[PDB]
Design an enzyme around this catalytic site. Sequence first.
Site, mmCIF file in Angstrom:
data_model
loop_
_atom_site.group_PDB
_atom_site.id
_atom_site.type_symbol
_atom_site.label_atom_id
_atom_site.label_comp_id
_atom_site.label_asym_id
_atom_site.label_seq_id
_atom_site.Cartn_x
_atom_site.Cartn_y
_atom_site.Cartn_z
ATOM 1 N N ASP A 81 -1.073 -1.413 -8.267
ATOM 2 C CA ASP A 81 -1.482 -0.362 -9.189
ATOM 3 C C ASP A 81 -2.140 -0.941 -10.456
ATOM 4 O OD1 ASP A 81 -1.927 2.333 -9.801
ATOM 5 O OD2 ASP A 81 -0.023 2.662 -10.776
ATOM 6 N N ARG A 129 -5.022 1.521 -17.469
ATOM 7 C CA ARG A 129 -3.888 2.325 -17.941
ATOM 8 C C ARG A 129 -2.575 1.590 -17.823
ATOM 9 N NH1 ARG A 129 -5.566 4.645 -13.172
ATOM 10 N NH2 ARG A 129 -4.114 3.967 -11.536
ATOM 11 N N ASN A 130 -2.516 0.577 -16.947
ATOM 12 C CA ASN A 130 -1.321 -0.256 -16.755
ATOM 13 C C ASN A 130 -1.354 -1.604 -17.442
ATOM 14 O OD1 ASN A 130 -0.231 1.772 -15.135
ATOM 15 N ND2 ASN A 130 -1.021 0.906 -13.240
ATOM 16 N N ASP A 144 3.642 -1.843 -15.101
ATOM 17 C CA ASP A 144 3.762 -0.855 -13.996
ATOM 18 C C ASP A 144 3.779 -1.496 -12.645
ATOM 19 O OD1 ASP A 144 4.431 1.312 -15.584
ATOM 20 O OD2 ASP A 144 2.497 2.241 -15.573
HETATM 21 C C1 LIG Z 1 -1.919 4.287 -21.145
HETATM 22 C C2 LIG Z 1 -0.450 4.301 -20.747
HETATM 23 C C3 LIG Z 1 0.146 5.508 -21.500
HETATM 24 O O1 LIG Z 1 -0.587 6.463 -21.743
HETATM 25 N N1 LIG Z 1 1.462 5.542 -21.810
HETATM 26 C C4 LIG Z 1 1.963 6.754 -22.433
HETATM 27 C C5 LIG Z 1 2.451 6.377 -23.778
HETATM 28 C C6 LIG Z 1 3.654 5.463 -23.597
HETATM 29 C C7 LIG Z 1 3.131 4.209 -22.936
HETATM 30 N N2 LIG Z 1 4.116 3.133 -22.819
HETATM 31 N N3 LIG Z 1 4.784 2.787 -21.668
HETATM 32 C C8 LIG Z 1 5.566 1.762 -21.948
HETATM 33 C C9 LIG Z 1 6.351 1.277 -20.936
HETATM 34 C C10 LIG Z 1 5.892 0.937 -19.730
HETATM 35 N N4 LIG Z 1 6.928 0.548 -19.005
HETATM 36 C C11 LIG Z 1 6.848 0.029 -17.653
HETATM 37 C C12 LIG Z 1 8.054 0.669 -19.720
HETATM 38 C C13 LIG Z 1 9.347 0.385 -19.372
HETATM 39 C C14 LIG Z 1 10.377 0.622 -20.293
HETATM 40 C C15 LIG Z 1 10.018 1.159 -21.561
HETATM 41 C C16 LIG Z 1 8.644 1.428 -21.847
HETATM 42 C C17 LIG Z 1 7.697 1.167 -20.924
HETATM 43 C C18 LIG Z 1 5.341 1.390 -23.269
HETATM 44 C C19 LIG Z 1 5.790 0.444 -24.161
HETATM 45 N N5 LIG Z 1 6.632 -0.520 -23.780
HETATM 46 N N6 LIG Z 1 5.378 0.397 -25.447
HETATM 47 C C20 LIG Z 1 4.461 1.347 -25.906
HETATM 48 N N7 LIG Z 1 3.999 2.294 -25.046
HETATM 49 C C21 LIG Z 1 4.441 2.285 -23.772
HETATM 50 C C22 LIG Z 1 2.470 4.507 -21.556
#
Ligand SMILES: */C=C/C(=O)N1CCC[C@@H](n2nc(-c3cn(C)c4ccccc34)c3c(N)ncnc32)C1
Length: 291
Positions: free
Chosen positions: A142, A146-147, A160
């Site tokens: 994936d 975005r990841n 991700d």
């Molecule tokens: C473009 C991705 C997006 O739009 N996001 C929405 C806003 C929050 C974003 N986000 N995800 C994490 C993240 C990802 N994963 C696998 C984890 C696991 C545990 C906690 C958080 C987390 C983000 C983190 N770590 N910091 C800031 N934004 C994050 C994804």
Amino acid sequence: GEAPNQALLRILKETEFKKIKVLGSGAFGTVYKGLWIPEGEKVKIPVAIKELREATSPKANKEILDEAYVMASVDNPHVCRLLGICLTSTVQLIMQLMPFGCLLDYVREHKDNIGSQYLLNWCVQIAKGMNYLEDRRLVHRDLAARNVLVKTPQHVKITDFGLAKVPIKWMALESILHRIYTHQSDVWSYGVTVWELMTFGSKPYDGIPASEISSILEKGERLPQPPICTIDVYMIMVKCWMIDADSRPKFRELIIEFSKMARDPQRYLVIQGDERMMDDVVDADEYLIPQ
Ligand SMILES: */C=C/C(=O)N1CCC[C@@H](n2nc(-c3cn(C)c4ccccc34)c3c(N)ncnc32)C1
């Protein structure tokens, strides 16, 4: 066969970290910005906390734990690892806070100020993360802009591993046809990911239904050359979208190519205006303290 996985899974009691704001809610769940204070240590670590939205299903807890398993098993500067889990009725994942969000939104929002140096460095960093996953015999499945998360504008990391061992417009042809996924399959996705960055966030094959995509690729059609890309850069993208998976470049090669280009960035990307471009808080990357 495989070597034993001796990664430690850290359990965080709910009282050692505090939720401060919401960063986003979706299919994925709810992600919060928070602060973690390991017990008895004078440190505050910025974190993000993920909760599965509005449910406590036995299938949902299974997949959260699968994600935690993969995130606990990596350790590289361009990959996101897990800090811990909290065993709450709703199981929570805790990881490092990546303050600038995902790279996709970052390029969209910040395009008028992104120079060639940042773009090519991101490409190197991602290729390094991917190469590390390949060393770990880990297929991403994936990879996309975005990841990729943004710690600082200079430092991004891949995330991700939900799917990590559908996102059709990022997939290799062999994956769409035959549900095959390999490291070389990830290269294709890498190529699309680079195209996303070089177009400052465009959607690929925009306004085309996913059902059609398989057919297009079979003919020989690919994503278009972005306006800032020299043929040198676009050729690299095209090689990632080669039909013969073994004809594609290896991540290790891509690190090298992009890295050469990062030494003289204005020769490979042409971007107008390119020249003119808490006392105890500790970042998670500096906190290497056990239990
Ligand atoms: C473009 C991705 C997006 O739009 N996001 C929405 C806003 C929050 C974003 N986000 N995800 C994490 C993240 C990802 N994963 C696998 C984890 C696991 C545990 C906690 C958080 C987390 C983000 C983190 N770590 N910091 C800031 N934004 C994050 C994804």
